Symmetry: D2
């Protein structure tokens, strides 16, 4: 369970780094199972018994429950290997626009979060379990826009419209910031946060596993391009992201 | 077929909207006829998958234009059913923005399936319902739709304290200061934000109460399915409801 | 102090009628004090009379007001109101009504912008109406209000004014406009974000009441102000769209 | 002189805004010189025509109007001179508690802000005009708790009850950041933000002027201890601040 200083930090920043959650032994168990699984590794829980158990470990479920406060369902669980020269352009943000064909909307209810009577209510959160140190920007560090999880104005739509071609992750931004982590730390993430990763320059592999959680009525995570015509299309339609003009 | 400023004001401030005379007499009759084809007090589950008639109605623009104006998300059809009500049927109160749920280790007072917001000129309601009325309902004994005023934006819970004080009567049978009724004509559509606390009066008159209902929400909501509590393996999908009158009446 | 059911009702409807807070004895006592001071408005009652100065601090008023403001408190206004036949009060208030502010148009009035947090309501401006006579039909000039309008997100009145209307909704009617009936010595606790008014009084006699407004200690005492002054030194409350603006 | 979309984003997401080089070095010498004619310098406009003009200068009013969006009133205007070993402990914060006699409240309406149809509505903002350079924490830099202008949990009360003695501007806090400014820069501040300054360890005076603005129905700024028995007390009652227990 999260302390009050942790809930406070989560609420105000949109994420929480929890240091030293998993032992060196466990991390190596996790690392081994990833190397055997040979870019992204979809559905880790169906492919391993150790990842099916990780997805329900109390070291992940207890902080998750404290920020979702709904009946839970496991929405996704993947592995991630990043090599030299990989990058993750910004996505998320609370007020980014989306065109529907007859209107543009400014809310994505899959990430719209609230607070009520001592409890945070976030619909979609991730637990990033790092399996390798990342201690400098060139290691491909997590980066985020400060406060962007409670943002009221869109940011990217005007960038794209004025013909930008450079991701903030490369060029910088007054409120872009990095997070540095050690093996077996967990990064608890509010998906409303606008975030990405620095371009990795270093040699070696960066590895992590990620589990996404939500209310029991959210469909399992899968990308959808748009509402289908028979209104039967399920999935998550993305709003403005840097990959749409960078 | 879109909603006026005044219609949006009313949906926003009351949690619902009667759109009158949407379907003509002929359509209403073909609808009832189709229900008669599918055949006391009884239910017609999953209408869109059992009838091409009702599969068309689900995607009719007279239902979709209003819905799109209050959901404003990539849309999905979550549910669709038929209802035939006779004498001595009642629907007790359910819904309400702030009703409590015991999760086991805690107590929560939000339900994110009905938690709605507003931003830059648009309403964002994640679960709305289109009721298509195939019968006139013109008095409370006909089993009229009833609701608690403003309950779609209530910050306090109502039902827990009544359950605890040992009440066993529904406000539907008993009355409440801000409990109001809604009267409709057949062919009227009632647009409904599911955050509203609502039910219907006990029906004591003769004849058949007939309606169809369709639920819409975002494409990342699952098709409607009742779920008692979170499944033991966090795989189960569905909707866990909060305090409803059925729980202690 | 308000009950959970009373807090629920106030939060969900924007007001609360608390029945029979003052007995017939106090009521006539209050009524007589209004005479001694002789639509007519009796401004600054607490300065004009020790009786109303006492009323304004009466725990029967302050306990329910504290339950809806929940700030360090300040008396912001106190007046009396005498109404007679053919008097009417058109709609004012409304959470999202517009105000033209020189170079922009705004749709929030922070003097009535209210919130909820951790079990408590926080309304910055509430009125306690003490009724000194019964009102049991619309033609008596009953309190009327637009349901849910204290938490409205769209403006109502501007569309009407631009569409060129000139009849008030208290006369013409409106789908969600309702009336409230009260008895002598009732208190009506009102959230000023609520859009309200009164029906036109067609009956004979006098409709008497006293109103005390309350707010945080950093609100100025109530005063109308046409607009921001050029030296930024003018204090007071600038009205958003009201029906009197075009009826 | 109105705020760009990016400046509005930053102010919304962080709770403040540094506006660089608003006043030239001639103007800044004019202000420093005037402050020599007259440590806190209370009510500057009433005391000096130069600062009466500055209080209504459009380089301040234009951005202020963009984040308040109400009929505007000037609520305070003071000057500030700090020397060595001066410090300013944390205060502000969206959810800091206040004991009200028979109850405990967690909103302060004088700084409770909102957003509606494209506009920010912040009832109390300060415009800080810096007359000297602050480029290191030991000059006594402005500091703030990130995202605390939208915080939903209290932070200080629990610290106070645990019995903490030292301030966060001394020990540090994981989300406490610093802001460096140059002479002639304007800091535009949402007062819901929890903020203060580092202890000044250098010589030379630290000069700035501050003007505070709100809606016309706000009383001019004065400190008030509690609501008075006659409910006639006007002014601003502060919630938990660090000075209460440090
Ligand atoms: Fe991501
Ligand atoms: Fe229902
Ligand atoms: Fe009024
Ligand atoms: Fe300050």
């Amino acid at each position: 369970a999260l302390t009050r200083e942790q809930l406070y930090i989560f609420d105000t920043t949109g994420f929480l780094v929890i240091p030293g959650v998993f032992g060196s032994g466990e991390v190596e168990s996790f690392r081994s199972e990833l190397e055997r699984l040979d870019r992204r590794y979809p559905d880790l829980p169906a492919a391993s018994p150790v990842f099916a158990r990780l997805a329900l470990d109390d070291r992940l479920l207890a902080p998750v429950r404290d920020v979702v406060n709904q009946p839970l369902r496991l929405l996704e669980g993947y592995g991630l290997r990043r090599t030299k020269d990989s990058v993750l352009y910004l996505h998320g943000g609370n007020s980014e626009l989306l065109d529907l064909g007859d209107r543009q909307v400014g809310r994505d209810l899959s990430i719209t979060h609230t607070y009520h009577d001592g409890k945070l209510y976030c619909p979609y959160v991730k637990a990033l379990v790092y399996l390798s140190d990342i201690q400098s920007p060139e290691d491909g560090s997590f980066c985020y826009v400060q406060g962007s999880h409670k943002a009221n104005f869109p940011l990217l739509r005007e960038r794209a419209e004025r013909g930008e071609n450079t991701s903030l992750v490369d060029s910088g931004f007054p409120t872009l910031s990095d997070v540095f982590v050690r093996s077996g730390d967990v990064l608890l993430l509010n998906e409303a946060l606008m975030h990405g990763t620095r371009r990795k320059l270093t040699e070696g592999d960066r590895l992590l596993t990620a589990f996404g959680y939500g209310p029991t009525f959210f469909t399992e995570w899968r990308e959808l391009d748009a509402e289908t015509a028979d209104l039967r299309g399920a999935g998550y339609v993305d709003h403005d992201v840097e990959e749409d003009f960078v």
